[PDB]
Amino acid sequence: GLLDGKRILVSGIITDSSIAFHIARVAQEQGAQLVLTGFDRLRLIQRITDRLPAKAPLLELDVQNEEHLASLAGRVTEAIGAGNKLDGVVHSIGFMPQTGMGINPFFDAPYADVSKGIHISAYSYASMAKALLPIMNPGGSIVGMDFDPSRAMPAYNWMTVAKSALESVNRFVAREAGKYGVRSNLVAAGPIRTLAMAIVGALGEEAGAQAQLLEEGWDQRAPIGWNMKDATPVAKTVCALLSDWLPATTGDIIYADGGAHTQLL
Amino acid sequence: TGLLDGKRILVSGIITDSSIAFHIARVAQEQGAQLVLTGFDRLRLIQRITDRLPAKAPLLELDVQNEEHLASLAGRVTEAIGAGNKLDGVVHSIGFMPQTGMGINPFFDAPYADVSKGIHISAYSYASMAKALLPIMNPGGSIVGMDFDPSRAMPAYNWMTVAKSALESVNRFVAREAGKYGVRSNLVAAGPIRTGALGEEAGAQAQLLEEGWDQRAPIGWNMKDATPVAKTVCALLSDWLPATTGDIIYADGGAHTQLL
Amino acid sequence: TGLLDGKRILVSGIITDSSIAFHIARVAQEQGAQLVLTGFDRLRLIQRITDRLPAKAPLLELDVQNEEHLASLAGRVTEAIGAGNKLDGVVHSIGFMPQTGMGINPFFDAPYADVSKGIHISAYSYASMAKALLPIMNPGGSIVGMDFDPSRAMPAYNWMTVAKSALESVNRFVAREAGKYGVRSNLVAAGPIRTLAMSAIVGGALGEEAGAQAQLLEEGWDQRAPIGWNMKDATPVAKTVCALLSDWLPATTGDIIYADGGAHTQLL
Amino acid sequence: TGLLDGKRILVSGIITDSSIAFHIARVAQEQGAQLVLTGFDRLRLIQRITDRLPAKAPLLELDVQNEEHLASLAGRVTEAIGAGNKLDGVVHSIGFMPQTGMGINPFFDAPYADVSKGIHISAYSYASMAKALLPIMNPGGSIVGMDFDPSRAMPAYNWMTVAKSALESVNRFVAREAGKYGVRSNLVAAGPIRTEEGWDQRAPIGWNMKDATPVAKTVCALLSDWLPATTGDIIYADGGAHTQLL
């Protein structure tokens, strides 16, 4: 397969609608040996990951928990046995409290909420690279999930700001990862109907309409179209970055959005 | 006629007479603006600095992390310019990142608590001030913030670069809200301004950036002079960029447009 | 004392009194600039237009594809402002792309002869203009060209988009050359302005479909723009050019200023 | 199984064994693609070069400035791949600028006729090759062109930089047309390959300007089905140098 005999960590699975779930599935189809991490509802997460092609160890990881991060590399090594290292890391984690999104005014989000969001959605990319780089092989690859924040838009609000921060964090992580012979990139995906997708049904009628408007305009703008209910094209893109087939790309963003961002109307 | 004749503009961020905000206020005054100034910590000390400005101006206390200062800010400004009057301009020239997040400390070594404080003061506060001051701004008004181009990574700037990226995104959103008021929102991205203390390596890094910046800039770059940056901000506060908002104007000698 | 008091500025691209160049010229004259104008083909018709400016100005002939017109322009400008006087500003508001590379014609069906002519006039000429006039410009001076944001593709604009992309790259290189003279070079990326050709297509002169895309482009532009966009008002763009011609943006060059309502900064 | 297993791919731009297109071709064949090659001037000479390719591939003639080559191309391709067969990928690895538009020669001194020829071969030809070949491409196919990041001005590269800026715009528009066929259009912006020393410096993973394989691999990635939602775009294979200021 594309990732034959590669040992790859995947964070971010919460349902079988999670982008990370599909990244995991495709990685396994492509021959990769996985270690998974989960936040909070690990009973649920375990049951969910049972439906993946192959069995995988599931580790606890709250990115805001300094102890989890500090014990993380050791718990992975045990999971994959001493002598072996990781070839890939997938950051598919995000969060922004309700006050920082939706119909709730941009100006009314408490800094505490915004800060919790940036910690989870942006700072933790660096946290995970820090914990995991010492157990990564050269030629390795760290990949995180992004949503093009280069332009403002309704509803997304402070999550946009967090992704803007994330992209900046990525460029710096690339500097550190390169010392290890490891690449660091982001996959900017178009809208995918995940857990929080959610806002289309929550963030306040109005925000929901705007989300639907965003979705609709995305499919039209994309020269090859965009669905939306299919996370597979995004998972394949992530896998492409984990493979040895983009070996000169780092600190960068690969857009798996149907080309929508390259078109105005 | 002065460029900002009759305009009423609030400037934050003056701490020394070397501060970018100090020269912005100076030029704005030379061009006829009526200023309200804000100050963070030692309010007595900056009063001494602000006394060296071309003309006297009200000095209001504003710690941007204190949500109480923010809630009362508009009232205290209206009291200063006299009730019945509003602001035509707001200048955000505030930035902070602890040494743990910039300079010599390894990028992975910055604790989030410090990063978070840095982001609050350097980016979120742009939204905070806008929230506080938009209800008392005139249509056609202008909010200007200070930026340092964070589109690419670089030595030392580290987490402040991440803050500046955050800020740019914040600026695009503030534009959406300021638009309801007829108000523009923009950032001025400035070249390096002189506002071995960090060691031999850091001193060489800084020298290399400065040399490289003047080298890269088609019209050169004078790190000793904040006057061109001040003037750019005054351009944005004026009425001569009326169709520009959510945007970034680069006052960097054009360095960012050139590879070598 | 106006923004541009005591400055000598060359303006190109006046063809009608609706031309962006016409509004730029008007506002510049209003701000105390001493203008020199250039004209391409209909030299006596444009004089009639240029006489509608608040101040009369020497109209010189310039076909940017005419290599001898370029070779003589500096001298003919000197003749109009008197020796010992130099130019402080230059406005390039010149654009052209044949209907084969723009509008309804399929992107693939534009012949290169047509595209090349478009790129010559719309992009290359920025550099040939700079080349001609730099040796008679004062330091601290300014050259500005008109742009339409080509970073993303869109219906109808087709090869004119390509030319503007080329123009943005040219401007970055012109900046390097002009820097040797203490001169800045910048573009103003304007939002869509109702030229007579723009009003015509909206009316339906390019057919029902083209007319629909036009409404859509304009309606969406004003929507996206946080401060809105009025396609019938070229004044905010003209002031932006004057800002750049002034000394108030002294450290900006090789760059693009967006006078577009902020639309380009907003996804929806 | 190969990455491009069973795929029919046209590859232009091979002139010597050091061409990006040579290694693109080389890596593609290693990944199980059946190739068609195209060459420009010295057809006999470049034929001797394609001999070294791991397999044999039918070599056709294509001057992108020649309307006749372009008009007959798809037919000459179908003839080589057999009726009933289409292409799955196309590689555009073509560039040219007359000396006066590059190097030491002043930016202002280059005649438009030189620039126009550069722009024709370097930028317009991407749409022209797409026009020709899309009617013979399978859905899910991929078109790839070679780019050098022109977003900032730089010494020496000069008018070639203007050509690349134009190419990036053309690519966005080709993607509109290609999408109608279910086909993607992307650019690979590669670092300097021998055909700045500060490039290896800025690159967080370094950069070896004698090694075209990583660039070649990136192109193969875009030709694969592993970047199925990317079009109108630019993929940087430059050691990440463009993401760092210093």
Ligand SMILES: NC(=O)c1ccc[n+]([C@@H]2O[C@H](COP(=O)([O-])OP(=O)(O)OC[C@H]3O[C@@H](n4cnc5c(N)ncnc54)[C@H](O)[C@@H]3O)[C@@H](O)[C@H]2O)c1
């Ligand atoms: N669905 C979309 O349209 C879309 C588009 C582009 C990018 N993204 C990004 O893709 C990623 C995955 O989100 P998703 O869309 O798959 O929905 P999701 O809810 O299934 O996955 C998000 C994950 O965040 C995890 N998380 C929250 N707090 C955490 C913590 N403190 N520690 C560890 N994990 C924590 C959750 O447990 C969850 O598994 C995000 O970073 C997101 O912003 C989503």
Ligand SMILES: NC(=O)c1ccc[n+]([C@@H]2O[C@H](COP(=O)([O-])OP(=O)(O)OC[C@H]3O[C@@H](n4cnc5c(N)ncnc54)[C@H](O)[C@@H]3O)[C@@H](O)[C@H]2O)c1
């Ligand atoms: N000096 C440069 O080269 C340069 C280049 C580009 C951008 N900038 C930006 O310009 C701006 C001003 O910084 P400077 O270069 O003038 O140095 P400076 O130290 O003189 O100004 C920074 C200001 O931050 C204010 N501040 C810190 N915490 C605050 C709080 N909690 N509440 C209210 N105010 C607070 C300080 O009081 C101070 O006046 C920043 O936004 C900065 O990042 C500087």
Ligand SMILES: NC(=O)c1ccc[n+]([C@@H]2O[C@H](COP(=O)([O-])OP(=O)(O)OC[C@H]3O[C@@H](n4cnc5c(N)ncnc54)[C@H](O)[C@@H]3O)[C@@H](O)[C@H]2O)c1
């Ligand atoms: N109308 C819009 O929406 C809009 C928006 C953004 C940018 N622009 C740009 O602004 C500029 C001015 O165009 P406009 O909108 O005012 O319409 P316009 O037709 O009034 O201006 C175009 C000018 O190019 C001149 N020109 C063509 N060939 C020439 C030659 N061989 N030599 C010398 N001059 C020649 C024309 O004669 C004309 O005056 C252009 O560069 C254009 O692409 C227009």
Ligand SMILES: NC(=O)c1ccc[n+]([C@@H]2O[C@H](COP(=O)([O-])OP(=O)(O)OC[C@H]3O[C@@H](n4cnc5c(N)ncnc54)[C@H](O)[C@@H]3O)[C@@H](O)[C@H]2O)c1
């Ligand atoms: N070498 C580098 O460092 C580098 C870096 C980034 C991008 N690129 C791009 O990669 C591609 C190939 O570059 P290269 O390094 O392999 O140089 P090269 O000399 O090996 O190949 C260039 C190709 O241009 C072709 N060509 C010129 N005129 C033609 C015409 N009229 N019709 C058809 N073909 C014609 C040549 O025949 C040749 O095969 C170009 O588009 C180039 O700009 C090269």
